[PDB]
Write a protein that binds this ligand. Structure first.
Ligand SMILES: [Mg+2]
Ligand SMILES: [Mg+2]
Ligand SMILES: [Mg+2]
Ligand SMILES: [Mg+2]
Ligand SMILES: [Mg+2]
Ligand SMILES: [Mg+2]
Ligand SMILES: [Mg+2]
Ligand SMILES: [Mg+2]
Ligand SMILES: [Mg+2]
Ligand SMILES: [Mg+2]
Ligand SMILES: [Mg+2]
Ligand SMILES: [Mg+2]
Ligand SMILES: [Mg+2]
Ligand SMILES: [Mg+2]
Lengths: 115, 150, 29, 183
RNA sequence: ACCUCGGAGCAGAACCCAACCUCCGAGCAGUACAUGCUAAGACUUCACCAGUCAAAGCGAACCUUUGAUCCAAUAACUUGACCAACGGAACAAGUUACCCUAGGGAAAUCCUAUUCUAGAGUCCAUAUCAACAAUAGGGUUUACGACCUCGUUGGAUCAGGACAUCCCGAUGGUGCAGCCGCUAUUAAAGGUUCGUUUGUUCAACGAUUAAAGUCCUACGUGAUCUGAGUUCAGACCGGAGUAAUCCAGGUCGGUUUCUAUCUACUUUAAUUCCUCCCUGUACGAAAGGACAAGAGAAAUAAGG
RNA sequence: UCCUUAAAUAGGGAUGGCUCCACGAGGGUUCAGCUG
RNA sequence: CCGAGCCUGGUGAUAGCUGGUUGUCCAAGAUAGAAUCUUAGUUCAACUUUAAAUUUGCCCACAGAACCCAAAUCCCCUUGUAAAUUUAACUGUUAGUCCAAAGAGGAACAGCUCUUUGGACACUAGGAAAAAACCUUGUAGAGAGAGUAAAAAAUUUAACACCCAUAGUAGGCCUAAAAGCAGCCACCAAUUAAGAAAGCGUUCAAGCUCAACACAAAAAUCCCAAACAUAUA
């Protein structure tokens, strides 16, 4: 039978090689994910379709910001083969109210407060 | 084998084994033996006069008759590997003996020279010429052997 | 009729797998 | 009894119960009181005729004072006629005695090719060598992507195509067939 | 045979489910006669119907397998048969080819050839054949009462094609001195008969042949013809059936019709055989008996 | 099993059981002749 | 036009069967259990639509769910989310097809018959040659802009060491003789180098090698893009 897949926890235990490869520090982890759907939910199980709808990834290639917290991460793990996850980087910190309308999400994953 | 799902076939192809590839080709990169040793060492002192020939063109019966005529005297015929005889020359300090033993070589170790009668026997068979030897650490060519016989 | 896997198909699958591995890393923290 | 004993065509007392073809064999995978053997490189069913020809071709070129051959598979018991299930990696016929592997290689290879499923003539040394080189393959492969890793992590949603048994077989065993080259 | 219900397989871990299917037993028995009355809250065979559990309270004592409604009977409480096709027509079987209408549709277990040599093969494997197995190629069968039974075809005409070659051609080997046979490779240009019995699909037989090949082509081909035979509508015989009728199980008889619209098409260096010469030559101890080459006769096919 | 043909799944002969005189656009077989 | 005439009427017989069922535009919209003289139908359920009321609904981290003796499932704090339940009204679909997976139909690999989980098709587009079911991808228009997704089959295999092997003795048992080749018993020994022999052949011998010295496939109308080995990834 085809069922939900239980991913072993060792899959989501990064190695120092992974840290060097991808440039994320396990200490002081990133706060927010940028998730984009890059794969169709057609020919995928209804639970993956539902998770995609919940995460708001109905449109492909449209970045969506989510919290980097265990529940959101569990949903992302369910649909990890359909999405691209990149940390949201804030070189100038989160935007202030003055420049809330002058932000731009660079393709590198950086939210810059000048545009 | 039944046809796999194409997605599974793609998975197998992607997960196919990839052997490690060395940068530079390693190829293109840089007690019978001791019994013979001791026996030949002993023989080199046992014999007083030595000679060598090429007793290979003879038949089994002819070689047997030659062996019988030699055993009529005290001389003993020997065959030993050149592969192991080449180290023996330098071991026994026989430098002039190196360009003498190659291919088939049959020694004629003795202490009493019946070389006159041996040459007489060899005469009736116009082949199998005598090859140079070295009696008591003194090299003798064929002419020297003939003079010694006479 | 049989079907065969091309180098392009293998490369596409490898690209997808690399994206998924990066997803694993970013989900690990 | 340094010979392959005759086996009954059918058990005298049928047994009720205690796919036996797919996947690696779990029993008789290692040499026991022998030095050479025939290894099954794939699952299959052995018939009574197959057993009889095994016995005939082994006891023909046999030296009772220097060779002793034993079975590793029981008599045909599974009803269909009666046959024996054999899984990949299962030894079929073992040999021992004062002998060398090349002395038996010829007819062992012949009888292995006779066998319905893929089979090989394997000594203890050759079995150890192939196990060690399989370990070397899986330790030195330069492919970052392995069937084991992808299937376990459900990368690409591949478990939609794979079987639950594929997670344990790691892609090496597909149905009754076995793929030793598959790392 | 089964049709309802219950228990087990049969589902590994909530439920549900493998229907069809396998096995078992119940239309209850034993017990008690509070084994009463009431009543929160729940379960449930995926609907409903129906079927379960139950605290508290009252009252006595001090439980382990099915069936509705109507209708009958009983003063009533209650009870009853049939509904077992067990969601149950109150009461109705066989048969139709004399039929009509409305529609729907059309792995194991066998054979062939190679491989291992088992082995036959005078001894001798590998001249030849060949076992079990493996490989391929072709065909048959299935999960269901392992009970019985039984479920369109040629011919004529014209042929197209394959080669897995029957003859003709070219070669290798031979357990063939020549003749031959046997075997294998290659070869599809060409060719591949007429009759008797049978409807024969076939088969046997007769006489030939160089040979009378194996197949594919929706029988290849039936808007080209014709014949069976399912099987028409008649009638006998045999078998089954109370009968009607049924049964390829035997026989005698027995009308489908097409004026061609479209596609396509409608004038693309011969083979055998025999006779003779060479040839009684080669070969061979003899017997027997050739190649290659040539000549002549026929016949067939094609074209005139 | 015999005859019939060279060849013959064809034909003929070795109250019931029988007897086919004649007849038949009945159903089979045959000699001879005749014939596109 | 008789297995039962014809005409008229009842009669617009009846038909769970066949066929048909006419403006424009938008929107929501999917396979599913039970019973049934029932499986070509229907009724209930489920789904579906509209309107309405209200408040939680789905996902799920632990904790938790059996003894006999696997993948997963159930349940719900968070969380991501915005739906869910109930009320009123209601038609229609519902004894499907294919794919992936796990099982049963006798301890039946394939084929079928079913059960279960999931997907797809009945819905768009691109690709896989053509293409319901494989891959990519969907929410709708115009554009003579742009970045991409899937998407290209691979392969070409067989030389080989050289050299020759005296002799105790045909080693004995029997076996006509069987000596190395009919069998079992030790399996020694000479030179230097040595099997009472691993394989051919002799009734048995004789003759020969090994070892030892030495140095894969096919078929039927007519093969089937054309072609191309090396210009920057
Ligand atoms: Mg049950
Ligand atoms: Mg219920
Ligand atoms: Mg009923
Ligand atoms: Mg009923
Ligand atoms: Mg009648
Ligand atoms: Mg041919
Ligand atoms: Mg009739
Ligand atoms: Mg008539
Ligand atoms: Mg006739
Ligand atoms: Mg009339
Ligand atoms: Mg009507
Ligand atoms: Mg819509
Ligand atoms: Mg009823
Ligand atoms: Mg109906």
């Amino acid at each position: 039978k085809f069922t939900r897949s239980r991913i072993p926890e060792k899959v989501f235990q990064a190695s120092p090689e992974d840290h060097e490869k991808y440039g994320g520090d396990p200490q002081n982890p990133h706060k927010l994910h940028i998730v984009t759907r890059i794969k169709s939910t057609r020919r995928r199980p209804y639970w993956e379709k539902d998770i995609i709808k919940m995460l708001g990834l109905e449109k492909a290639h449209t970045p969506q910001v989510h919290k980097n917290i265990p529940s959101v991460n569990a949903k992302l793990k369910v649909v990890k083969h359909l999405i691209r996850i990149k940390p949201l980087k804030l070189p100038q910190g989160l935007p202030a109210e003055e420049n809330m309308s002058n932000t731009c999400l660079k393709s590198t994953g950086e939210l810059v407060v000048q545009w | 084998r039944r046809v796999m799902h194409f997605q599974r076939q793609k998975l197998m192809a992607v997960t196919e084994y990839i052997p490690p590839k060395p940068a530079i080709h390693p190829s293109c990169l840089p007690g019978l033996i001791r019994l013979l040793r001791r026996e030949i060492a002993a023989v080199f002192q046992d014999n007083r006069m030595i000679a060598v020939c090429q007793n290979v063109a003879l038949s089994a019966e002819d070689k047997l008759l030659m062996r019988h005529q030699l055993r009529k005297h005290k001389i003993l015929m020997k065959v030993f590997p050149n592969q192991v005889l080449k180290p023996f020359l330098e071991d026994s300090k026989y430098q002039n003996l190196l360009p003498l033993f190659v291919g088939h070589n049959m020694l004629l170790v003795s202490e009493e020279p019946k070389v006159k009668e041996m040459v007489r026997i060899l005469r009736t068979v116009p082949f199998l010429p005598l090859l140079g030897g070295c009696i008591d650490d003194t090299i003798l060519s064929r002419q020297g052997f003939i003079n010694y016989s006479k | 009729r049989p079907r065969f896997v091309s180098l392009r198909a293998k490369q596409n699958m490898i690209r997808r797998l690399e994206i998924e591995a990066e997803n694993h890393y970013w989900l690990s923290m | 009894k340094p010979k392959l004993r005759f086996i009954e065509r059918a058990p005298l007392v049928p047994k009720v119960r205690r796919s036996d073809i797919r996947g690696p064999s779990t029993e008789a995978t290692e040499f026991t009181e022998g030095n050479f053997a025939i290894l099954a490189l794939g699952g299959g069913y052995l018939h009574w005729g197959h057993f009889e020809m095994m016995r005939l071709t082994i006891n023909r070129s046999m030296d009772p004072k220097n060779m002793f051959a034993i079975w590793r598979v029981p008599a045909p018991f599974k009803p269909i006629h009666y046959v024996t299930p054999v899984k990949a990696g299962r030894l079929v016929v073992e040999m021992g005695g004062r002998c060398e592997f090349e002395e038996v290689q010829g007819f062992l290879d012949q009888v292995a090719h006779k066998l319905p499923f893929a089979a090989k003539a394997v000594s203890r040394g050759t079995l150890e060598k192939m196990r060690k080189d399989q370990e070397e393959r899986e330790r030195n492969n330069q492919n970052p992507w392995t069937f084991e890793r992808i299937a376990t992590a459900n990368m690409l949603g591949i478990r939609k195509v794979l079987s639950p048994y594929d997670l344990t077989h790691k892609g090496k065993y597909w149905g009754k067939f076995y793929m030793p080259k598959r790392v």
